[PDB]
Amino acid sequence: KRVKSEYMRLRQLKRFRRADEVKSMFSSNRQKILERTE
């Protein structure tokens, strides 16, 4: 069926917002990386 079609359709905006947030998460986590590594 066309389930995957609408799945990816909504996943467009879902993954847009998700990319924004995970960029924030990348930043935060890389930071802690710096700390602990040092």
Next chain:
Amino acid sequence: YSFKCVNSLKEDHNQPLFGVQFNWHSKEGDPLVFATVGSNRVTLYECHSQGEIRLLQSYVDADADENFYTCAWTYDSNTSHPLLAVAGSRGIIRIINPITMQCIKHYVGHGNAINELKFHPRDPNLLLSVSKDHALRLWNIQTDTLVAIFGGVEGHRDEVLSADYDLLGEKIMSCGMDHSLKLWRINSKRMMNAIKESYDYNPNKTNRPFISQKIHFPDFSTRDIHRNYVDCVRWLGDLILSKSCENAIVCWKPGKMEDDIDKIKPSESNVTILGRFDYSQCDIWYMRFSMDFWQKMLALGNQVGKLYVWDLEVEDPHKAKCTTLTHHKCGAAIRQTSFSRDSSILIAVCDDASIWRWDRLR
């Protein structure tokens, strides 16, 4: 970001090797030393300039037949000598002192082959041993006592493959053939009471056998990520990395993006995937990836002899990176990658008892 083949070697027994481990306990300035284990031999080399590598030492076991599997560099708090331990199919764990060129400790408590050895980033007397016995053990290599046995009513059902400390050393992940990935904790009160106890026991003192700790429950788990084997996992700050035979490496976090790592309820039943990484021709299992001590680059061997390299930087995993350094000599396979404390050199083992070397030009 450019390594070049400045040397390549080959053994004589021609039996495939698996292990590559720089000694990441080099007092600043000391020469680069690294080792590699094969069918039933170990090998000691040193990195020299101009793509020179110098044979240093090598031992062998004759009294039986084994295919050594893993190694790990540590030291001695008492006199600061370098320390290397290895283990193979027979399931025994040996501990060798190159300063005297002898083995000083051997451990036998498993039931099958061993698959990996790692140490606690802080404590140097804590050895984690992963086996095929579905049981992940953990020893005090100093007082000669076991501590924990993770596995049981809720453990792994088939041949645990790979594990990885968290960056700080209080959390572990595990992966095995059963598509299953489970979380263990070390920070629990009970656990650290146990450890402190372990550091205190005289057999001559008591008529009692030391009492280990059995743990029958993961902190959290799932099998929804892959639909095939899972054979290498890496902590990423507080994120996760794992590979399968599905020719893609994945990064995720448990629960939801909002879900903290240290609030996770044991009955958690959701995970958050972030991104995927891609490559070609990893259609067999038992192949590992590594990362720099500075957590900025990614290395990975390959089946057909290629390479694939990324950066652990702000490069968005959608289009993070793509770097394939290649040579025309062996395309048998490559098992394992390894960096120095810095990112100077990178070694990898081909499937045909042949070594490679790649010197970086940043």
Next chain:
Amino acid sequence: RPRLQAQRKFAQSPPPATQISDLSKRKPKTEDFLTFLCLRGS
């Protein structure tokens, strides 16, 4: 078929019946094997 193929680890893929001296021939086989006559019992 894809969900039916087993996964794979690796890739796709004397004449002279001389004497006892054969003993003394065997234990030294390098570094001045004495008596100079054991080589015939190779």
